[PDB]
Design a protein around this ligand. Structure first.
Ligand SMILES: Nc1nc(=O)c2ncn([C@@H]3O[C@@H]4COP(=O)(O)O[C@H]5[C@@H](O)[C@H](n6cnc7c(N)ncnc76)O[C@@H]5COP(=O)(O)O[C@@H]3[C@@H]4O)c2[nH]1
Ligand SMILES: Nc1nc(=O)c2ncn([C@@H]3O[C@@H]4COP(=O)(O)O[C@H]5[C@@H](O)[C@H](n6cnc7c(N)ncnc76)O[C@@H]5COP(=O)(O)O[C@@H]3[C@@H]4O)c2[nH]1
Ligand SMILES: [Zn+2]
Ligand SMILES: [Zn+2]
Lengths: 361, 362
């Protein structure tokens, strides 16, 4: 049963796609950002959110993807809750427009996400050619994506995600109030210092139906989420140099590789993404706060505990958003029962047979 | 010992603890320094970066402190006049300078000047560096002999980077490296041919002669080819790959380098030794032991001891030839004196018998 340790060791693909193949992807990025803070464009104050992808972190789960956020601070913005999702909002301007080039993107009173993204893409889709240094290309604007992905073809088929995000330094939305329950895990001292940080809105189309197509934004917690990924232990020295290790990131990497390899053969699992796993292991980390329950010498037990948690999540159709309690990710609106019962069958099959899907020599 | 060589390599992840962020900052500053250094009216307009690996410079000499980067400028048809009989030191003489060349004014007669060329380079880098905006990056005073242009990248504390200028010549390799790189029975004659149809480089480092004229001596560097050997270190192409087996080659290299640093950082008496003595000794060791099976991760305790016994051999026998230049003996009597070679012999032998107590840093 100590073969998982050999899956984890084989998982690392160091330089290929992460080390020398990730500090090149950075180099392209800051070129774009610098040059993107050029002229008199609405985005002259665009900035790269402090996040972790390039620093050997895109390499843990879902290695075939790259991601970056371009934040852009806004003024006093009123948030109109979009129906009852708790995550999709309608961005308005608190006090009447005076000094902001973001009035070019106003559809009525609300800030339209398509007009802004449609023009965002046009600038980036114009300044990547303005440099010849490497072979970088951009993807098509497909529905659902609030990103402008750069398929660069230096390292196989890379696709660095550029995600425009609205930064609001005000208090967090009221739908995230009972969320982030890290009191008994990380502490009320850590939880408070994270909620006084700005929250971000990504231009995701809430496709509820007939109402606003591209005027809806979504709450992004990628900044807070990686503060939890690197600071996951109850001891501050967890997985540090002068500290003890744990199997939290490894039990995260194994569930991502399990769901990633399952979706490659079944297109009926096109309803589950890596964020279902992320949020699942957050509920499991909060349930088991002590680092003793995640000792590296219990990788098979901790992974089986996480698998039985994801099976109960599917089984009862209840995987609440870690920051937004009322927002249930495994709602029947979003995922039909048949997919839950289909994915339960494969995860159980791989769990009862020594994980044959990880059979890589 | 109680199999603690693997727990030392795992703690050598300190890279991540403190050099991850700094490596992006070095990447991001050099790049803005390089692209801003591609401006007109600068003889280095056509300068580039020689890709000699990455910032996680732990692969070579895993040092948790300072760094190095190399700049390559392509020159036209050099005539390498060997500096007397070094093998590594030359004089860059020019045959016909093609009209329109930016290296015309760096000659002190028939011979190219490393002292001059390294003057405007430092000069231009001093200019450009302070026009970089929100970042506090200044340059140090030029320490003597030292042929680089170290950069002080003020942020969290200190961040040094040696900006090493190096001429690129896509021509032929000198005669002194004609029997060097003996990878014929390890990496193959089919890859040694390709690695030598690749350019060679020259760094502005003066030789130590109280006589003749050592102001403009250039030195051979093979850091571009040394890198390939590190990442392509096995007889089997799938060594340390996804669909292959692992090996303790680079494993031993980090151990051997951290052993010498901690020893160097303990006594100044070991100041004559550098990280290139253990990279070169492991090149001969990988050539002597070519099979992947001879470097098995389950035999890390013995594969490292065997590397120790080979390195001490090179000390007590005073023989450690430059891997690309058979003539140049790095452990010669004129480079390092017997007194320092016996000192390191007792210190390494001391650690080897007592289970390496110098690695005790939990
Ligand atoms: N860096 C970043 N921060 C974000 O907030 C974000 N939100 C979306 N994306 C990227 O946009 C696309 C989302 O479309 P899709 O729904 O079909 O699948 C997505 C999406 O449904 C879901 N998802 C990802 N991040 C979030 C998030 N932060 N909150 C809710 N759902 C998310 O998981 C899938 C893949 O996520 P990523 O691998 O992070 O990159 C996604 C992807 O490019 C984001 N990228
Ligand atoms: N990237 C790079 N390629 C070079 O050829 C090179 N040559 C010198 N340097 C750097 O210049 C200084 C050398 O002065 P010192 O002799 O006291 O110690 C040097 C020098 O004695 C020795 N050396 C000899 N040949 C090489 C070589 N081909 N590559 C690296 N180091 C070499 O190595 C020692 C330091 O190693 P580095 O860690 O690579 O960085 C050095 C350092 O900043 C180089 N840096
Ligand atoms: Zn940990
Ligand atoms: Zn190998």
């Amino acid at each position: 049963p100590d073969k998982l340790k050999k899956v984890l060791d084989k998982l690392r693909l160091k330089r290929k796609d992460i080390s020398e193949a990730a500090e090149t992807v950075n180099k392209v990025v800051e070129r774009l950002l610098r040059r993107m803070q050029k002229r008199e464009s609405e985005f002259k104050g665009v900035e790269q959110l402090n996040t972790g992808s390039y620093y050997e972190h895109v390499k843990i789960s879902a290695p075939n993807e790259f991601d970056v956020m371009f934040k852009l601070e806004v003024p006093r913005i009123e948030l109109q809750e979009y129906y009852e999702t708790g995550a999709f909002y309608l961005v308005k301007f608190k006090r009447i427009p005076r000094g902001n080039p973001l009035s070019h993107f106003l559809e009525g009173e609300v800030l339209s996400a398509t007009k802004m993204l449609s023009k965002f893409r046009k600038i980036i889709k114009e300044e990547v050619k303005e440099i010849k240094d490497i072979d970088v290309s951009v993807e098509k604007e497909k529905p659902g994506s609030p990103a402008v992905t750069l398929l660069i073809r230096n390292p196989e088929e890379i696709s660095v995600d550029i995600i425009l995000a609205l930064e609001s330094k005000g208090s967090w939305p009221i739908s995230t109030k009972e969320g982030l329950p890290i009191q008994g895990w990380l502490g009320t001292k850590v939880r408070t210092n994270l909620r006084r940080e700005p929250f971000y809105l990504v231009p995701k189309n809430a496709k509820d139906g007939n109402s606003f197509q591209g005027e809806t934004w979504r709450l992004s917690f990628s900044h807070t989420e990686k503060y939890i990924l690197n600071n996951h232990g109850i001891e501050k020295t967890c997985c540090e140099s002068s500290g003890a290790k744990c199997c939290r990131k490894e039990c995260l990497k194994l569930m991502k590789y399990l769901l990633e390899q399952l979706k490659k053969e079944f297109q009926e699992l096109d309803a589950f993404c890596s964020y279902h796993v992320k949020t699942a292991i957050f509920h499991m980390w909060t349930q088991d706060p002590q680092d003793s329950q995640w000792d590296p010498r219990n990788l098979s037990s901790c992974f089986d505990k996480l698998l039985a948690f994801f099976l109960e999540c599917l089984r009862t159709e209840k995987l609440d958003h870690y920051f937004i309690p009322k927002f249930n990710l495994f709602s029947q609106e979003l995922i039909d029962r048949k997919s839950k019962e289909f994915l339960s069958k494969k995860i159980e099959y791989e769990r009862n047979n020594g994980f044959p899907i990880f059979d890589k020599l």
